[PDB]
Protein backbone atom coordinates (compact mmCIF):
# COMPACT_ATOMS: atom_id res chain seq x y z
CA UNK A 1 0.00 0.00 0.00
CA UNK A 2 2.88 2.38 0.75
CA UNK A 3 4.30 1.41 -2.65
CA UNK A 4 0.92 2.34 -4.13
CA UNK A 5 1.07 5.75 -2.45
CA UNK A 6 4.55 6.37 -3.84
CA UNK A 7 3.50 5.27 -7.33
CA UNK A 8 0.47 7.59 -7.34
CA UNK A 9 2.58 10.48 -6.08
CA UNK A 10 5.20 9.94 -8.77
CA UNK A 11 2.61 9.60 -11.53
CA UNK A 12 0.79 12.77 -10.54
CA UNK A 13 4.01 14.75 -10.05
CA UNK A 14 5.25 13.72 -13.50
CA UNK A 15 1.91 14.69 -15.04
CA UNK A 16 2.05 18.01 -13.19
CA UNK A 17 5.56 18.83 -14.41
CA UNK A 18 4.55 17.84 -17.94
CA UNK A 19 1.57 20.19 -17.66
CA UNK A 20 3.70 23.16 -16.61
CA UNK A 21 6.26 22.44 -19.34
CA UNK A 22 3.49 22.17 -21.94
CA UNK A 23 1.79 25.35 -20.74
CA UNK A 24 5.07 27.28 -20.83
CA UNK A 25 5.81 26.02 -24.34
CA UNK A 26 2.31 26.95 -25.48
CA UNK A 27 2.35 30.47 -24.04
CA UNK A 28 5.88 31.22 -25.26
CA UNK A 29 5.13 29.92 -28.75
CA UNK A 30 1.86 31.88 -28.86
CA UNK A 31 3.84 35.00 -28.02
CA UNK A 32 6.31 34.03 -30.75
CA UNK A 33 3.53 33.70 -33.36
CA UNK A 34 1.90 36.99 -32.37
CA UNK A 35 5.21 38.85 -32.49
CA UNK A 36 6.00 37.22 -35.84
CA UNK A 37 2.76 38.42 -37.40
CA UNK A 38 3.36 41.83 -35.81
CA UNK A 39 6.74 41.91 -37.58
CA UNK A 40 5.18 40.76 -40.86
CA UNK A 41 2.69 43.63 -40.58
CA UNK A 42 5.51 46.04 -39.72
CA UNK A 43 7.34 45.32 -42.99
CA UNK A 44 8.25 48.59 -44.71
CA UNK A 45 10.36 49.89 -47.63
CA UNK A 46 14.00 49.16 -46.66
CA UNK A 47 16.86 49.67 -44.19
CA UNK A 48 19.65 52.19 -43.60
CA UNK A 49 23.26 51.02 -43.22
CA UNK A 50 24.25 54.26 -41.47
CA UNK A 51 22.54 53.01 -38.31
CA UNK A 52 24.79 49.94 -38.36
CA UNK A 53 27.81 52.14 -39.06
CA UNK A 54 27.60 53.90 -35.66
CA UNK A 55 26.94 50.61 -33.84
CA UNK A 56 30.03 49.00 -35.37
CA UNK A 57 32.31 50.90 -32.98
CA UNK A 58 30.15 49.76 -30.07
CA UNK A 59 30.55 46.19 -31.28
CA UNK A 60 34.30 46.86 -31.44
CA UNK A 61 34.29 47.94 -27.80
CA UNK A 62 32.15 44.98 -26.73
CA UNK A 63 34.48 42.59 -28.58
CA UNK A 64 37.40 44.17 -26.73
CA UNK A 65 35.56 43.55 -23.46
CA UNK A 66 34.84 40.01 -24.66
CA UNK A 67 38.51 39.10 -25.06
CA UNK A 68 39.24 40.88 -21.78
CA UNK A 69 36.63 38.97 -19.78
CA UNK A 70 37.90 35.80 -21.46
CA UNK A 71 41.36 36.61 -20.12
CA UNK A 72 40.23 37.32 -16.56
CA UNK A 73 38.10 34.17 -16.53
CA UNK A 74 41.13 32.20 -17.72
CA UNK A 75 43.29 33.65 -14.95
CA UNK A 76 40.60 32.90 -12.37
CA UNK A 77 40.49 29.33 -13.67
CA UNK A 78 44.27 29.14 -13.24
CA UNK A 79 44.08 30.24 -9.61
CA UNK A 80 41.13 27.86 -9.33
CA UNK A 81 42.92 24.64 -10.15
CA UNK A 82 45.90 25.90 -8.17
CA UNK A 83 43.71 26.04 -5.06
CA UNK A 84 42.11 22.74 -6.06
CA UNK A 85 45.46 20.95 -6.25
CA UNK A 86 46.65 22.54 -3.00
CA UNK A 87 43.58 21.39 -1.08
CA UNK A 88 43.64 17.94 -2.68
CA UNK A 89 47.28 17.28 -1.83
CA UNK A 90 47.16 18.69 1.69
CA UNK A 91 44.00 16.83 2.68
CA UNK A 92 45.11 13.58 1.02
CA UNK A 93 48.40 13.64 2.94
CA UNK A 94 46.64 14.47 6.21
CA UNK A 95 44.04 11.73 5.72
CA UNK A 96 46.67 9.12 4.85
CA UNK A 97 48.75 9.96 7.93
Amino acid sequence: VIIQKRVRGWLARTHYKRTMKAIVYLQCCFRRMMAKRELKKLKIEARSVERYKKLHIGMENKIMQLQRKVDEQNKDYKCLMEKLTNLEGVYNSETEK
Binding site: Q4, K5, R6, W10, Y16
Partner: protein, 147 residues
Protein backbone atom coordinates in the same frame (compact mmCIF):
# COMPACT_ATOMS: atom_id res chain seq x y z
CA UNK B 1 -1.13 27.67 10.79
CA UNK B 2 -0.31 29.86 7.78
CA UNK B 3 1.58 28.63 4.73
CA UNK B 4 4.13 30.31 2.49
CA UNK B 5 2.67 32.88 0.11
CA UNK B 6 4.46 31.25 -2.82
CA UNK B 7 3.00 27.92 -1.69
CA UNK B 8 -0.46 29.53 -1.61
CA UNK B 9 0.04 30.84 -5.14
CA UNK B 10 1.16 27.41 -6.35
CA UNK B 11 -1.93 25.87 -4.77
CA UNK B 12 -3.97 28.52 -6.58
CA UNK B 13 -2.53 27.61 -9.98
CA UNK B 14 -2.99 23.90 -9.25
CA UNK B 15 -6.62 24.55 -8.28
CA UNK B 16 -7.25 26.58 -11.43
CA UNK B 17 -5.52 24.06 -13.71
CA UNK B 18 -7.16 20.91 -12.35
CA UNK B 19 -10.51 22.70 -12.52
CA UNK B 20 -11.88 22.34 -16.05
CA UNK B 21 -15.12 24.29 -15.62
CA UNK B 22 -13.29 27.36 -14.29
CA UNK B 23 -15.88 27.84 -11.53
CA UNK B 24 -13.61 27.08 -8.58
CA UNK B 25 -14.80 23.61 -7.50
CA UNK B 26 -12.83 20.36 -7.24
CA UNK B 27 -14.37 16.89 -7.36
CA UNK B 28 -13.29 13.87 -5.31
CA UNK B 29 -11.31 12.44 -8.24
CA UNK B 30 -9.69 15.83 -8.83
CA UNK B 31 -9.10 16.05 -5.07
CA UNK B 32 -7.17 12.79 -5.08
CA UNK B 33 -5.30 13.84 -8.21
CA UNK B 34 -4.23 17.18 -6.69
CA UNK B 35 -3.25 15.49 -3.41
CA UNK B 36 -1.02 13.12 -5.37
CA UNK B 37 0.26 15.95 -7.60
CA UNK B 38 1.23 18.39 -4.85
CA UNK B 39 4.22 16.24 -3.89
CA UNK B 40 3.28 14.72 -0.56
CA UNK B 41 2.24 11.08 -0.34
CA UNK B 42 -1.51 10.58 0.13
CA UNK B 43 -2.62 7.26 1.58
CA UNK B 44 -5.56 5.57 -0.14
CA UNK B 45 -7.17 5.23 3.28
CA UNK B 46 -6.22 8.83 4.01
CA UNK B 47 -7.50 9.82 0.56
CA UNK B 48 -10.89 8.35 1.44
CA UNK B 49 -10.68 10.04 4.85
CA UNK B 50 -10.13 13.40 3.15
CA UNK B 51 -13.03 12.66 0.80
CA UNK B 52 -15.22 11.90 3.82
CA UNK B 53 -14.15 15.13 5.52
CA UNK B 54 -15.01 17.05 2.34
CA UNK B 55 -18.41 15.33 2.36
CA UNK B 56 -18.79 16.46 5.97
CA UNK B 57 -18.08 19.96 4.68
CA UNK B 58 -20.65 19.13 2.01
CA UNK B 59 -21.55 19.78 -1.63
CA UNK B 60 -18.97 17.25 -2.84
CA UNK B 61 -16.88 20.14 -4.17
CA UNK B 62 -13.87 22.06 -2.87
CA UNK B 63 -13.84 25.82 -2.41
CA UNK B 64 -10.64 27.81 -2.10
CA UNK B 65 -10.78 28.28 1.72
CA UNK B 66 -11.47 24.56 2.04
CA UNK B 67 -8.57 23.97 -0.34
CA UNK B 68 -6.29 26.03 1.91
CA UNK B 69 -7.45 24.14 5.00
CA UNK B 70 -6.71 20.81 3.32
CA UNK B 71 -3.35 22.22 2.22
CA UNK B 72 -2.65 22.81 5.91
CA UNK B 73 -3.78 19.26 6.67
CA UNK B 74 -1.55 17.88 3.90
CA UNK B 75 1.55 19.83 4.95
CA UNK B 76 0.91 18.59 8.49
CA UNK B 77 1.92 15.21 7.04
CA UNK B 78 5.51 14.15 6.38
CA UNK B 79 7.16 11.72 3.97
CA UNK B 80 10.34 9.73 4.61
CA UNK B 81 12.10 7.99 1.73
CA UNK B 82 14.42 5.87 3.89
CA UNK B 83 11.41 4.07 5.36
CA UNK B 84 9.87 3.30 1.96
CA UNK B 85 13.30 2.20 0.70
CA UNK B 86 13.56 -0.20 3.65
CA UNK B 87 10.03 -1.42 2.95
CA UNK B 88 11.05 -2.05 -0.67
CA UNK B 89 14.16 -3.93 0.47
CA UNK B 90 11.96 -6.13 2.67
CA UNK B 91 9.52 -6.49 -0.23
CA UNK B 92 12.11 -8.06 -2.52
CA UNK B 93 12.34 -11.81 -1.99
CA UNK B 94 16.11 -11.65 -2.47
CA UNK B 95 16.40 -8.28 -0.75
CA UNK B 96 19.50 -7.32 -2.74
CA UNK B 97 17.72 -4.44 -4.52
CA UNK B 98 17.23 -6.32 -7.81
CA UNK B 99 13.81 -7.87 -8.39
CA UNK B 100 11.71 -9.09 -11.31
CA UNK B 101 9.62 -6.21 -12.63
CA UNK B 102 6.75 -8.32 -14.01
CA UNK B 103 6.39 -9.92 -10.58
CA UNK B 104 6.39 -6.40 -9.13
CA UNK B 105 3.50 -5.35 -11.38
CA UNK B 106 1.60 -8.53 -10.53
CA UNK B 107 2.02 -7.99 -6.79
CA UNK B 108 1.00 -4.32 -6.82
CA UNK B 109 -2.03 -5.40 -8.84
CA UNK B 110 -2.73 -8.03 -6.17
CA UNK B 111 -1.35 -6.47 -2.98
CA UNK B 112 -2.37 -2.88 -2.37
CA UNK B 113 -4.65 -1.02 -4.72
CA UNK B 114 -4.68 -2.40 -8.26
CA UNK B 115 -2.64 -0.14 -10.51
CA UNK B 116 -4.32 0.42 -13.86
CA UNK B 117 -2.87 -1.25 -16.94
CA UNK B 118 -1.99 2.19 -18.31
CA UNK B 119 -0.18 3.09 -15.08
CA UNK B 120 1.44 -0.36 -14.93
CA UNK B 121 2.81 -0.09 -18.47
CA UNK B 122 3.87 3.52 -17.90
CA UNK B 123 5.85 2.37 -14.86
CA UNK B 124 7.24 -0.48 -16.96
CA UNK B 125 8.73 1.64 -19.72
CA UNK B 126 9.75 4.43 -17.33
CA UNK B 127 11.79 1.89 -15.35
CA UNK B 128 13.81 1.55 -18.59
CA UNK B 129 14.67 -2.06 -17.69
CA UNK B 130 13.13 -5.27 -19.03
CA UNK B 131 10.40 -6.86 -16.93
CA UNK B 132 12.06 -10.27 -16.90
CA UNK B 133 15.41 -8.66 -16.15
CA UNK B 134 16.23 -7.46 -12.66
CA UNK B 135 15.15 -3.91 -11.84
CA UNK B 136 16.32 -1.72 -8.96
CA UNK B 137 13.53 -0.16 -6.93
CA UNK B 138 16.28 1.79 -5.16
CA UNK B 139 16.49 3.81 -8.38
CA UNK B 140 12.80 4.65 -7.92
CA UNK B 141 13.47 5.61 -4.29
CA UNK B 142 16.32 7.86 -5.43
CA UNK B 143 14.17 9.54 -8.08
CA UNK B 144 11.57 10.11 -5.37
CA UNK B 145 14.26 11.73 -3.23
CA UNK B 146 15.13 13.95 -6.19
CA UNK B 147 11.64 15.47 -6.21
Amino acid sequence: DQLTEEQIAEFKEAFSLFDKDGDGTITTKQLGTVMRSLGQNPTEAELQDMINEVDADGNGTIDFPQFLTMMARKMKDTDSEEEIREAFRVFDKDGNGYISAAQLRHVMTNLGEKLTDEEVDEMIREADIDGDGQVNYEQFVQMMTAK
